Amino acid sequence: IPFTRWPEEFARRYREKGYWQDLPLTDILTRHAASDSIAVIDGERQLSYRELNQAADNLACSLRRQGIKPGETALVQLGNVAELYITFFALLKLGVAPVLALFSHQRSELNAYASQIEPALLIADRQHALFSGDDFLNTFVTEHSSIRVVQLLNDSGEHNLQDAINHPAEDFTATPSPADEVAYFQLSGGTTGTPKLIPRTHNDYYYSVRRSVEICQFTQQTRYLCAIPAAHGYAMSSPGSLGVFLAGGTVVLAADPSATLCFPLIEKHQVNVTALVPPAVSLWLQALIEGESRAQLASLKLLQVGGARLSATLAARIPAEIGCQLQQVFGMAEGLVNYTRLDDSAEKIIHTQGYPMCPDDEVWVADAEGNPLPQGEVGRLMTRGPYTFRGYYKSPQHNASAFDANGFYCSGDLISIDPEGYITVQGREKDQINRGGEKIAAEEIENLLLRHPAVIYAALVSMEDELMGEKSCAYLVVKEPLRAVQVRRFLREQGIAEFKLPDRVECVDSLPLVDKKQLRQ
Numbered sequence: 001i002p003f004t005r006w007p008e009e010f011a012r013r014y015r016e017k018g019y020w021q022d023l024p025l026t027d028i029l030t031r032h033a034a035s036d037s038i039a040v041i042d043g044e045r046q047l048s049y050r051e052l053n054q055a056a057d058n059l060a061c062s063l064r065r066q067g068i069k070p071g072e073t074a075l076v077q078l079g080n081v082a083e084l085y086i087t088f089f090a091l092l093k094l095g096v097a098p099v100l101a102l103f104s105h106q107r108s109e110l111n112a113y114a115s116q117i118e119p120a121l122l123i124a125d126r127q128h129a130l131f132s133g134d135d136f137l138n139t140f141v142t143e144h145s146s147i148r149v150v151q152l153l154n155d156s157g158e159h160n161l162q163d164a165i166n167h168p169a170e171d172f173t174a175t176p177s178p179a180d181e182v183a184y185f186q187l188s189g190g191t192t193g194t195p196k197l198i199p200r201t202h203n204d205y206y207y208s209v210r211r212s213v214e215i216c217q218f219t220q221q222t223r224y225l226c227a228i229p230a231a232h233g234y235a236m237s238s239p240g241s242l243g244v245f246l247a248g249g250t251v252v253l254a255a256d257p258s259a260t261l262c263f264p265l266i267e268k269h270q271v272n273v274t275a276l277v278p279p280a281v282s283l284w285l286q287a288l289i290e291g292e293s294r295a296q297l298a299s300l301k302l303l304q305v306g307g308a309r310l311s312a313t314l315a316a317r318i319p320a321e322i323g324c325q326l327q328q329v330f331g332m333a334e335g336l337v338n339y340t341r342l343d344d345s346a347e348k349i350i351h352t353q354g355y356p357m358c359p360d361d362e363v364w365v366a367d368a369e370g371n372p373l374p375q376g377e378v379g380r381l382m383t384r385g386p387y388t389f390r391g392y393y394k395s396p397q398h399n400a401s402a403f404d405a406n407g408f409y410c411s412g413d414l415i416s417i418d419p420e421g422y423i424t425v426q427g428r429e430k431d432q433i434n435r436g437g438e439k440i441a442a443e444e445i446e447n448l449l450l451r452h453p454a455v456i457y458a459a460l461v462s463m464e465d466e467l468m469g470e471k472s473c474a475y476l477v478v479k480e481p482l483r484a485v486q487v488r489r490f491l492r493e494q495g496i497a498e499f500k501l502p503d504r505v506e507c508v509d510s511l512p513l514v515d516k517k518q519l520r521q
């Protein structure tokens with residue numbers, strides 16, 4: 001499985017310093033294979049590490065019997081369910097590298113992922129609108145003929161993922177890919193018209209988990225509510241569910257971050273850490289103001305907030321109104337994660353997005369033409385390090401633009417750095433809407449909009465929104481009367497995720513040739 005390797009001297013350095021340990025990610029789970037302590041709670045169901053590890057072996061073995069081989073790829077679509085983890089470790093034990101699509105993703109995204117990786121295996125959920133029946137499947141399996149095996153959650157027929165999980169593995173020996181090879185693909189937020197895959201090796205990903213575990217001080221006491229989409233990197237590895245597993249703690253799954261669901265789960269299971277995006281924080285604080293008892297949250301000791309910028313105002317309300325500590329988390333699927341620390345001053349936790357997890361994360365600030373700016377100045381975030389990728393999957397064209405000659409990746413973020421070394425996110429350069437933490441590549445939606453018979457020109461831009469931070473607005477130059485609901489129906493027909501439908505549509509007589517900078521003015 002081809003990907004952009006680190007130069008040999010970076011690998012060597014990163015091994016000498018102890019960052020790359022050459023262990024497979026399966027070791028996160030198998031070190032606890034003998035443990036009957038609880039690893040995952042999902043509704044009424046509670047799976048121990050022993051059971052979780054056996055479930056991954058069973059599924060891996062069953063897939064091996066059905067002909068899946070090491071070095072092949074898979075497409076996985078599972079929400080906040082225990083079977084997400086069973087599947088991730090089962091594929092890791094076989095040396096198969098998955099994309100974990102989010103439940104919210106639809107045809108265009110699944111098609112895009114399948115087209116790039118040519119999965120031999122599709123695993124999905126009949127609860128998803130696309131898979132309750134068999135029509136889409138037939139089309140998907142026809143148009144992506146690489147697929148030989150389909151397993152489905154909540155299925156009673158021949159393709160029931162449970163039957164595979166429940167079938168005891170006879171004589172199963174794991175064959176994880178080598179540690180310096182690809183373990184899995186992450187999804188980028190998106191800055192272009194087609195989605196970009198981020199290969200993650202075992203060395204690089206395990207280090208990001210292990211080190212996030214030291215910084216967040218996770219242990220067997222950790223009881224972690226995973227309420228945001230479980231397959232996103234923030235939920236998975238920063239320190240996420242995998243850091244919880246590493247530490248031997250417990251992951252509590254929630255379908256969504258609503259107070260309605262989560263306040264009760266936090267009290268019931270005595271949750272002590274969770275991860276949210278800013279709007280979920282506001283909604284929580286407002287639920288308390290509408291009279292939810294603060295005591296449901298007593299056991300909470302650490303609340304991470306990331307995905308998008310937390311305002312200082314909102315941040316300060318966390319210790320005050322919830323009474324746990326805040327940790328700001330500014331990371332990216334491509335790699336780099338900055339954290340505020342648990343012993344940082346209130347000033348740094350409230351007003352900054354922390355600093356890199358690794359001492360050899362290298363971060364500088366560039367001006368418009370690639371030159372370093374002195375500290376305090378606002379510019380483009382440039383970075384490289386032991387867990388930051390060196391290229392997107394099969395993307396020579398885009399890769400040429402995304403990295404400088406020295407291997408530094410530009411995140412598209414505008415930042416400034418403190419005298420103390422802390423980073424503050426000041427804005428953005430990449431053509432991306434950050435809708436309450438969820439990323440929308442504007443070019444993707446614009447291209448879809450231009451396919452409408454009536455749309456001549458199209459621009460998608462963010463607009464300030466108090467709850468979500470940013471909402472999306474589509475500015476269109478049109479031939480004929482066009483209402484928002486027509487645009488949304490149409491985009492939905494193209495088969496994209498709901499959060500990607502414009503919150504607002506506006507027909508305008510003209511747009512500048514599209515020069516969005518001009519448009520903002």
Ligand SMILES: Nc1ncnc2c1ncn2[C@@H]1O[C@H](COS(=O)(=O)NC(=O)c2ccccc2[N+](=O)[O-])[C@@H](O)[C@H]1O
Pocket residue numbers: 187188189232233234235238305306307308309310328329330331332333334335336337353411413425434437439
């Ligand atoms: N804390 C933050 N403040 C302002 N912007 C933030 C932020 N955290 C993430 N972002 C933005 O989100 C982009 C990364 O997008 S992402 O691939 O969906 N990943 C994440 O947001 C993320 C957030 C926290 C922890 C881990 C990740 N992650 O690597 O998945 C960054 O380049 C920023 O533009």
